[PDB]
PDB file of C-alpha atoms and ligand atoms in Angstrom:
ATOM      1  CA  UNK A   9     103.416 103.743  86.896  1.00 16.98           C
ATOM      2  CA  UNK A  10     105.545 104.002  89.887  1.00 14.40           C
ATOM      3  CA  UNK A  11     105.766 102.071  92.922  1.00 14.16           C
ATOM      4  CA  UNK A  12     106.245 102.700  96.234  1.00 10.63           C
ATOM      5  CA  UNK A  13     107.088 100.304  99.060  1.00 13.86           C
ATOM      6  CA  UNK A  14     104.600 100.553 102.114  1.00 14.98           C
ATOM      7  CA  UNK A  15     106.110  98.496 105.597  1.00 14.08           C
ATOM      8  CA  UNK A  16     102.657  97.990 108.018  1.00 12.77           C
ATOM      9  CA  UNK A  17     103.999  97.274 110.886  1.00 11.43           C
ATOM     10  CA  UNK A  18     102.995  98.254 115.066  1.00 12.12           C
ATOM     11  CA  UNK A  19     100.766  96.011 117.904  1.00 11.49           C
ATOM     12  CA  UNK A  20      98.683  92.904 117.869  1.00  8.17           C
ATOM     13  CA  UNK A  21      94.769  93.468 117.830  1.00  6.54           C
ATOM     14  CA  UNK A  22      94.849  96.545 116.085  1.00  5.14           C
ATOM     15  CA  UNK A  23      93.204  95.874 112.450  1.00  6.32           C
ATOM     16  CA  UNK A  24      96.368  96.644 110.127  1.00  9.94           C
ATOM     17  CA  UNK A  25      95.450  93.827 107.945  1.00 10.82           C
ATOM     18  CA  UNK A  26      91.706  94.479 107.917  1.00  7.97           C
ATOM     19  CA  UNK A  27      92.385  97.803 106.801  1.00  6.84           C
ATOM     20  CA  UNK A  28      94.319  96.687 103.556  1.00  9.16           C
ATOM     21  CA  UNK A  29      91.767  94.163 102.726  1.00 11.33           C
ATOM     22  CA  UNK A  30      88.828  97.152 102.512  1.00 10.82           C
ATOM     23  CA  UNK A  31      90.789  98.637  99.852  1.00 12.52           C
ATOM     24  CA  UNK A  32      92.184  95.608  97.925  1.00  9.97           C
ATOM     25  CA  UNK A  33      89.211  94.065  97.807  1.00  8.94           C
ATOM     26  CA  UNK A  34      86.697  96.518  99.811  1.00 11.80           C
ATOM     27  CA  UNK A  35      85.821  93.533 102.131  1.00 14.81           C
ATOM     28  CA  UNK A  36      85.577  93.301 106.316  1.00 12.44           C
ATOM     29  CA  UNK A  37      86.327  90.751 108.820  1.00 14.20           C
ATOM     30  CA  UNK A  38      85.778  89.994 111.726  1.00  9.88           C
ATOM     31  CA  UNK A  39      87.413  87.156 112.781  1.00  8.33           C
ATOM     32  CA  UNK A  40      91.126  88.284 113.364  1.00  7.60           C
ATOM     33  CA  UNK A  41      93.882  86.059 111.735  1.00  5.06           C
ATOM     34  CA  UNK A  42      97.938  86.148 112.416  1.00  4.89           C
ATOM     35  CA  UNK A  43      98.835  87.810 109.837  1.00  2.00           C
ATOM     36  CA  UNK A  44     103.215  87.120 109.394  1.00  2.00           C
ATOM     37  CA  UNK A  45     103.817  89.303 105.438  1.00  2.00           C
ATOM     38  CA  UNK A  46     101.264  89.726 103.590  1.00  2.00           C
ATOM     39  CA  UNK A  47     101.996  91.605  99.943  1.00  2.00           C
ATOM     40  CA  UNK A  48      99.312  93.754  98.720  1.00  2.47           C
ATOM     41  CA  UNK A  49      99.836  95.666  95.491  1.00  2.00           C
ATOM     42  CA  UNK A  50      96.941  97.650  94.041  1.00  2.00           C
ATOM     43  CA  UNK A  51      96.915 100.879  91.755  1.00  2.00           C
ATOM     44  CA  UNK A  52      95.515 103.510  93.386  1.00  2.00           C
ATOM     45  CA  UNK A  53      94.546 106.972  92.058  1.00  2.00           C
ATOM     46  CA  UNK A  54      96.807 109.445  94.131  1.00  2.00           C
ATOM     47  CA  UNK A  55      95.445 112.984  93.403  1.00  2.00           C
ATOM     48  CA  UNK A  56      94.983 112.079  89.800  1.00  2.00           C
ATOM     49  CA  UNK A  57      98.611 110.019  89.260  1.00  2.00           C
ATOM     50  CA  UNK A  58      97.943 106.460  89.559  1.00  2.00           C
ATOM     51  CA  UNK A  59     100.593 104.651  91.664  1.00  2.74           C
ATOM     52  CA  UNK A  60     101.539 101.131  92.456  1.00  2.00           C
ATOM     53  CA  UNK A  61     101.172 100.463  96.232  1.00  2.00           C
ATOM     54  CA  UNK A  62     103.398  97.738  97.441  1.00  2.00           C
ATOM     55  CA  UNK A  63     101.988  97.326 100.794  1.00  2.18           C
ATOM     56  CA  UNK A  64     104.487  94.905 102.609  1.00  2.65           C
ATOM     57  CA  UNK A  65     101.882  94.044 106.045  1.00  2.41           C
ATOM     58  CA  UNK A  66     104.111  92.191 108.610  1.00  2.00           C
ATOM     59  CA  UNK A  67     104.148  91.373 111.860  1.00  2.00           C
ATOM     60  CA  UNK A  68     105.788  93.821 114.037  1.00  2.00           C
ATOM     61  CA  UNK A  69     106.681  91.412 117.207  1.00  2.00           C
ATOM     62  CA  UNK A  70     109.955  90.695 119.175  1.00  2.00           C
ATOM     63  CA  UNK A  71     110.700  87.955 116.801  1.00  2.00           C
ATOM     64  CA  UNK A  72     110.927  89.979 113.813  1.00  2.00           C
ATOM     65  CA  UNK A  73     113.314  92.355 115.289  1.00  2.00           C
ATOM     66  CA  UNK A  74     115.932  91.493 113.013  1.00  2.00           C
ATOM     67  CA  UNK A  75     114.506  90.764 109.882  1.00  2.00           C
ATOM     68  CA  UNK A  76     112.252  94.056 110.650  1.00  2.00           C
ATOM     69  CA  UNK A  77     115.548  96.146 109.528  1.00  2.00           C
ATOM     70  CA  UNK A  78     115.382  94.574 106.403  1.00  2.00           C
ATOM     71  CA  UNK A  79     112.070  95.449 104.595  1.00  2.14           C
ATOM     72  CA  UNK A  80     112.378  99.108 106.696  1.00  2.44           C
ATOM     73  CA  UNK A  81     115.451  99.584 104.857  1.00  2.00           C
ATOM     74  CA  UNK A  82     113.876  99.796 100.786  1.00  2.00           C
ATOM     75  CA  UNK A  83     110.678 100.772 102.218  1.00  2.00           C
ATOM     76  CA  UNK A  84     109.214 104.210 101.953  1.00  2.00           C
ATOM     77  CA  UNK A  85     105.977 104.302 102.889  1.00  2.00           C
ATOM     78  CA  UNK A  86     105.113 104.063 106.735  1.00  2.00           C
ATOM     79  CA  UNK A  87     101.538 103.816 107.962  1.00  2.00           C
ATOM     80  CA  UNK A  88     101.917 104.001 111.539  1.00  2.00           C
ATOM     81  CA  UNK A  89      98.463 102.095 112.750  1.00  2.00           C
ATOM     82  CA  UNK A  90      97.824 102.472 116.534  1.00  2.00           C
ATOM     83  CA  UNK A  91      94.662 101.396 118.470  1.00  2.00           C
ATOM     84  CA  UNK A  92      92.424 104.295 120.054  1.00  2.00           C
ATOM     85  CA  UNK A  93      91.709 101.321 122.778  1.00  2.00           C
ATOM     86  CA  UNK A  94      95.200 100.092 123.313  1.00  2.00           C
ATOM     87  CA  UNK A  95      97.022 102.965 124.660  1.00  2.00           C
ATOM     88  CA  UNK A  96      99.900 100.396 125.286  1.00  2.00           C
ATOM     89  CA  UNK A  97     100.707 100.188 121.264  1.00  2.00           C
ATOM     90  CA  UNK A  98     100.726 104.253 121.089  1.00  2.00           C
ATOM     91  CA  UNK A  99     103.637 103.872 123.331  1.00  2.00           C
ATOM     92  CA  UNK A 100     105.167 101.379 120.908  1.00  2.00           C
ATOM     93  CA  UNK A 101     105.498 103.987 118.861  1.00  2.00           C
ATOM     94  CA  UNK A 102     108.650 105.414 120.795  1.00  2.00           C
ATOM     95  CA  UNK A 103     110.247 101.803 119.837  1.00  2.00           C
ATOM     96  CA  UNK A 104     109.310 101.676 116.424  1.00  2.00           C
ATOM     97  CA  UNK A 105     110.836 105.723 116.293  1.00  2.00           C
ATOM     98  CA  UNK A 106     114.175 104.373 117.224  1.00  2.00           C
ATOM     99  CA  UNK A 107     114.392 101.740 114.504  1.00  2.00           C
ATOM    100  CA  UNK A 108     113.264 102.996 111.985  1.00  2.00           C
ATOM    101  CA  UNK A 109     115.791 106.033 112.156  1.00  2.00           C
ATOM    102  CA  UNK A 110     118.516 103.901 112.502  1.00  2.00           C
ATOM    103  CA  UNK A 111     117.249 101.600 109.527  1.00  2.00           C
ATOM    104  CA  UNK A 112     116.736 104.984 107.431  1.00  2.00           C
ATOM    105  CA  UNK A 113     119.614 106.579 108.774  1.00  2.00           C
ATOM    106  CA  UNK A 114     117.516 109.895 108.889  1.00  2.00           C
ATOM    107  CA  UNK A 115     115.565 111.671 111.743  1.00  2.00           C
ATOM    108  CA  UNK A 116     113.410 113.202 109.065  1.00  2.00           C
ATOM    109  CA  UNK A 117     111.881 110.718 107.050  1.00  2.00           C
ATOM    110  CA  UNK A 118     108.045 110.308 105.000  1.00  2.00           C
ATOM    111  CA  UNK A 119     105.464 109.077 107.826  1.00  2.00           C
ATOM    112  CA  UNK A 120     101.752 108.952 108.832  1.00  2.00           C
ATOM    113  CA  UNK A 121     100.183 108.608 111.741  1.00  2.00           C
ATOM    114  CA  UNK A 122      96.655 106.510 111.750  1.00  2.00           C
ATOM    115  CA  UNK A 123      94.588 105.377 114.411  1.00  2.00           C
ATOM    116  CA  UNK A 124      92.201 102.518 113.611  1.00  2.00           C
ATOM    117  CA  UNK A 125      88.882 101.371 115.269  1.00  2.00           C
ATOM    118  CA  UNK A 126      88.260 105.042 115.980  1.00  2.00           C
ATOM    119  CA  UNK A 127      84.663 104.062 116.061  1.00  2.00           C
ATOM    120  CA  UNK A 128      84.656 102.183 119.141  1.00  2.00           C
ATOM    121  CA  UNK A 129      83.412 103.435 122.016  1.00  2.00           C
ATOM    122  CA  UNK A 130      86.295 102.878 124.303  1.00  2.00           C
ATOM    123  CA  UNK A 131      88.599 105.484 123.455  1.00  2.00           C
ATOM    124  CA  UNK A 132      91.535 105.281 126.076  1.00  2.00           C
ATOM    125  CA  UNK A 133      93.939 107.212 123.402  1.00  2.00           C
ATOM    126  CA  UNK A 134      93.384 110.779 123.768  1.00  2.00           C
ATOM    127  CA  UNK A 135      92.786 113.258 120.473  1.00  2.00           C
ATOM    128  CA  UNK A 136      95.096 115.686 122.252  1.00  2.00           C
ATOM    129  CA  UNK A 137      97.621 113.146 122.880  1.00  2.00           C
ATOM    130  CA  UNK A 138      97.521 111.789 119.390  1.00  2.00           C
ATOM    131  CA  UNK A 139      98.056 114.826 117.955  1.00  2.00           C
ATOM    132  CA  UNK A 140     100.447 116.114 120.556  1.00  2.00           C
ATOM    133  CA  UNK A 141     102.713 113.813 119.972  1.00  2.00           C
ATOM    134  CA  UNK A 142     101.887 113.605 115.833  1.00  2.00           C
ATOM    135  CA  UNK A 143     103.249 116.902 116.159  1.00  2.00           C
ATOM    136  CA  UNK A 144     106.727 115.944 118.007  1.00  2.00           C
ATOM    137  CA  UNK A 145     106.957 113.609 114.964  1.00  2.00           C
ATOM    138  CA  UNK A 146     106.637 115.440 112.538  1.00  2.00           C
ATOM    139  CA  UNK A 147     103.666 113.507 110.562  1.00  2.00           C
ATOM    140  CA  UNK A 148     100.033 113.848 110.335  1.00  2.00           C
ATOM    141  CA  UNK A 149      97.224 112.094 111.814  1.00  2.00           C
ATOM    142  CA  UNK A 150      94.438 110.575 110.550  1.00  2.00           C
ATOM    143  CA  UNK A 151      91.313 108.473 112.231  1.00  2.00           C
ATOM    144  CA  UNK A 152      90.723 105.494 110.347  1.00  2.00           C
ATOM    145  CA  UNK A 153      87.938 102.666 110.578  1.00  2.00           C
ATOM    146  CA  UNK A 154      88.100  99.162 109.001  1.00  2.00           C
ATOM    147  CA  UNK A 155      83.864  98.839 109.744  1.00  2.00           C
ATOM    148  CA  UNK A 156      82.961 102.487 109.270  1.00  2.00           C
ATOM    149  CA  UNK A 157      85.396 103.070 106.510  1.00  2.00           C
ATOM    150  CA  UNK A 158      86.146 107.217 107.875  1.00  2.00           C
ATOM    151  CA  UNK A 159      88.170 108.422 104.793  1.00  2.00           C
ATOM    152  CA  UNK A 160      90.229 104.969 104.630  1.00  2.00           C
ATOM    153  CA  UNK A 161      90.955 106.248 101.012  1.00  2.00           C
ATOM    154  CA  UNK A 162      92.156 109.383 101.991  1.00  2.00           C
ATOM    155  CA  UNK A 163      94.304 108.020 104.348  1.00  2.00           C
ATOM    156  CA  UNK A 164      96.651 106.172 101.801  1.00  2.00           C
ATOM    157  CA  UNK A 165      96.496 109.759  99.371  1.00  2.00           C
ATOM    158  CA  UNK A 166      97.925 111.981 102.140  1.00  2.00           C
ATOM    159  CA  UNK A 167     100.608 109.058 102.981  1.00  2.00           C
ATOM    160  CA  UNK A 168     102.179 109.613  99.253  1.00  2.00           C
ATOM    161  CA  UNK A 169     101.417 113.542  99.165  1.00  2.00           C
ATOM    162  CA  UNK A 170     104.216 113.577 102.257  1.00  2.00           C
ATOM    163  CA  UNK A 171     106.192 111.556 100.314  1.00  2.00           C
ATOM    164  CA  UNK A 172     106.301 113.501  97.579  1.00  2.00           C
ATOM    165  CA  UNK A 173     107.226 116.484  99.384  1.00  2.00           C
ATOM    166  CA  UNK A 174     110.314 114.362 100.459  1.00  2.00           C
ATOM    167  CA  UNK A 175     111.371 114.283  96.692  1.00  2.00           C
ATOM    168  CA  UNK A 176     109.800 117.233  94.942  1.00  2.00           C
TER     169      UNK A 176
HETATM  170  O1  UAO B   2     112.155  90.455  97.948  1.00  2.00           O
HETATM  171  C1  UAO B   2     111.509  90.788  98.944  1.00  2.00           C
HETATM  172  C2  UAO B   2     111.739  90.249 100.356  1.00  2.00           C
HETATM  173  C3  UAO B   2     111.181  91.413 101.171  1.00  2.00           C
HETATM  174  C4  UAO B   2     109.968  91.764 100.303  1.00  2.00           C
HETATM  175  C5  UAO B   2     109.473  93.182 100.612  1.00  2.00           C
HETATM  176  C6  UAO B   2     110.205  94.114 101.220  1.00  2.00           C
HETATM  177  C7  UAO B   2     109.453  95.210 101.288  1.00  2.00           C
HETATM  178  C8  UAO B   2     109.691  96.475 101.806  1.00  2.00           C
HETATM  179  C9  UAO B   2     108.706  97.451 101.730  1.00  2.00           C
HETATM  180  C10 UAO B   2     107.484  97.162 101.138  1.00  2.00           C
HETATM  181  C11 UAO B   2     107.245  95.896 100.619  1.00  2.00           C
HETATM  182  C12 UAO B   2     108.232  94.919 100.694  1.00  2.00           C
HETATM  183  N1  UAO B   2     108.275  93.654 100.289  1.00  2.00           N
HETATM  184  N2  UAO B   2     110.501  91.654  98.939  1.00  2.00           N
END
């Protein structure tokens, strides 16, 4: 059984937590809590190979900048959660970009992009823009839902079948 190390990381408000908890324990809340590291580990069937997920959620704020560097460093996995409302944290993404290059010390590096809440009814992020800029990247997109649960599961497969295209 392999691991792999997942770093959450991006804005405030947008569910990243919430998210992990529907597939540790398949359970939703409403009330949002800070959330500083969290470690969630649970074997999940990855188009038939089981693999360890070490999902590492942190905070991604201005006063984790440089202890950020640290966990980015051995981790492999990125889910790159942005909110569909908050167009402010799809421009965080530009930040986020620039550190974690220099922490991997490669442009090209295994990454999904996943927007969450995409079943609220304020949707200020753009589809086209999403993908636009998915594309730029070089990583795919994927709308997720913590309450509607749209292919949450799915979501994690397709974040270790890029990964393994990085190795095999
Ligand atoms: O001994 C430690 C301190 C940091 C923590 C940790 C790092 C990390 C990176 C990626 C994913 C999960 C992760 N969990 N383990």
């Amino acid at each position: 059984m392999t691991e792999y190390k997942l770093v959450v990381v991006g804005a405030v408000g947008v569910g990243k937590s919430a998210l992990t908890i529907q597939l540790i324990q398949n359970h939703f809340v409403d009330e949002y809590d800070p959330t500083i590291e969290d470690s969630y580990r649970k074997q999940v069937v990855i188009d038939g190979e089981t693999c360890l997920l070490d999902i590492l959620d942190t905070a991604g704020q201005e006063e984790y900048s440089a202890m950020r560097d640290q966990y980015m460093r051995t981790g492999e996995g990125f889910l790159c959660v942005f909110a569909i409302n908050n167009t402010k944290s799809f421009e965080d993404i530009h930040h986020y970009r620039e550190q974690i290059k220099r922490v991997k010390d490669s442009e090209d590096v295994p990454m999904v992009l996943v927007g969450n809440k995409s079943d609220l009814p304020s949707r200020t992020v753009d589809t086209k823009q999403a993908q636009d800029l998915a594309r730029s990247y070089g990583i795919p997109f994927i709308e997720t839902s913590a309450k509607t649960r749209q292919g949450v599961d799915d979501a994690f497969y397709t974040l270790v079948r890029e990964i393994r295209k990085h190795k095999e």
